[PDB]
Design a protein around this ligand. Structure first.
Ligand code: MN
Ligand code: MN
Ligand code: MN
Ligand code: MN
Lengths: 207, 208, 207, 207
């Protein structure tokens, strides 16, 4: 049965990521923005199934933008909620990710140096997009994606940070640097460790 | 003197576009977002001048993104402020644009049908971008641009509407459709008419 | 039966477009290049069908490039063969396209001015791509597409000219301007007229 | 003095790369294609100089495509000629690159596995473009670039392979796989080794 995705439940209350991310943002981001991606993804997929059966290639290609945008939106936000957690949770302690943080230190020198590099990448995004820590081969890389484009080229997403203005604007206004500075407090390193130790299939099973 | 752009004071109060666009949005949009494009444009242009004089092509190519993004940011927002005005102004009455609205009607059937088409294009933008009515040849077209990419390919911008989330989110949240419905109330048709009757360089005089 | 596309028969012999386009090129272009797009399209669709039925969105998005590229390749070349014909055919006479040429003249002033504009667009393409005359609304526009991107966004393709180097290089070498000058002699205006008078679905019926 | 680039002399005769790349191709590729990038780059830079002094930003943005395409064209081909050499030369033996090949083996397992991965990347390019082995940080990566886009983002080019159809079509026709198989015979590993050991600036000193 094509196109039966549903909006996943949050692992925490809307206000659980405060003070880094306000309850108003988490509620809008999940119940409105993510909801819209799920809904529009299901509709595009059913329409695609029709075109595919009719061997209608122009319609299939014309539907790709909706499927990438809403499918990517669903993929990215689903990953996002799971790699966030309350700042007071032990999951927010990078000690929860011994293997990943060891490789981060191996690659950037230290967790702090990595955070600086990641922050630069996030703040350098022009327009809407995401920043990701990914596993490529056996190594780690910082990559950015445009709009709702997902990391589907083969790399394993370890964690993502949303840099769309709706992710921060109500609370931080134009101050995206402050959003980035504060989001580190609510990164779920237990999730990141899990993804780092598993393969691409493992990371996407939550969908 | 390379890279000496400045942001002119807005010709109306921050709250002058209410209730279509809130005072907080206009203030942030102009004094923070647009100024930042101006600052970073000037910085990129000066770095570029060094690279140009040195025939350093790798650095020039590496700087293109900053110049297009910030240069486009300054161009687009400069056009935007000039094609917005208070809802109570006679300039917001489409009767201020007889020649343009006649061509709009000839093209889309009516101004109403044009607004619906334009709205569909604006709401269809994925991510950040702008929607434009442009003059191409002698005809009119609706086009969209991504991020801060400007309309510099030869067509004449007639007016633009910003669909970046910072353009509406504080007031409308995710409700971008209401933003688009309401922005028609504060479109400066006098400005649109002037641009419609002039050429591409005439439109970009706003950058002087 | 997903992915059962076949290479369409040419409407003429391989040498029918001489001297504008050599027999060698027509043979390679059809039997190798277009064929490879068809084969790889079928392969992509079979893989996509699996991902779709399985609601595997990451795989679907990863497959989009192959479907757009090969699907677009199939669409574009299918249109191309049908809007070419022998130079001696009455179909190559623009008098075969009265309604289209009338609209062309209204838009660019004359057929010659249109050809000059189209030529500039074709020669201005960086890398691989196509130039198209399209109908959008009741009006005409010249558009270019990159690689094998097809005109599937809603406008009606009227005719296309391939600017990939494989379309001309064996015969014209780097001299693409000469290729463009000569291809006007073999444009099937009868086909162009038919597309101009019909709708978007009508144009894609050849598939 | 803005825009005074010149077409570099080849390090060998036009026929020196046979049988892998024909004399006809090397001569056309260098004397026509590369020459045109140089000339159009110089002209664009001189025009840019005017627009820059006039603080004419629309004109500057409009000129970017020409500067990236022709500038990238000049950069890429300049690197290309230097990382090619006669097949009978010991410089074409990977033993000429002990440090680089050691790092390749560490990364892909073996030189053969690297060649397979590189070939896959090269053959996977849609449209016109280049494949590169680059050094980013301390590691090696295979990347592809579209059209004439250069590797200018910070990574150090180690060697490049041109996958534009003009690089092979006269000799290999549609057989890009055969082109890739055969180009390994004329890769200059001595040059590759030098670039691998050197700086980003050092690699571009060739300009
Ligand atoms: Mn988001
Ligand atoms: Mn804006
Ligand atoms: Mn072709
Ligand atoms: Mn080349």
């Amino acid at each position: 049965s094509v196109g039966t995705f549903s909006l996943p439940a949050l692992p925490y209350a809307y206000d659980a990521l405060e003070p880094s991310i306000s309850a108003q943002i988490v509620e809008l981001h999940h119940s409105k923005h993510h909801q819209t991606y799920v809904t529009n993804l299901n509709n595009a997929l059913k329409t695609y199934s029709t075109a595919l059966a009719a061997n209608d290639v122009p319609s299939q290609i014309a539907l790709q933008a909706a499927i990438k945008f809403n499918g990517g939106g669903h993929i990215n936000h689903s990953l996002f909620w799971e790699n966030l957690c309350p700042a007071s949770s032990p999951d927010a302690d990078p000690a929860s990710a011994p293997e990943l943080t060891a490789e981060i230190a191996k690659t950037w020198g230290s967790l702090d140096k990595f955070k600086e590099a990641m922050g630069k990448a996030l703040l350098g995004i022009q327009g809407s997009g995401w920043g990701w820590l990914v596993k490529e081969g056996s190594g780690l890389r910082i990559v950015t994606t445009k709009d709702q484009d997902p990391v589907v080229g083969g790399e394993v997403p370890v964690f993502g940070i949303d840099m769309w203005e709706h992710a921060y604007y109500l609370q931080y206004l134009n101050g995206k640097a402050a959003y980035v500075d504060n989001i580190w407090k609510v990164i779920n390193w237990k999730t990141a460790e899990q993804r780092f130790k598993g393969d691409r299939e493992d990371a996407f099973k939550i969908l």
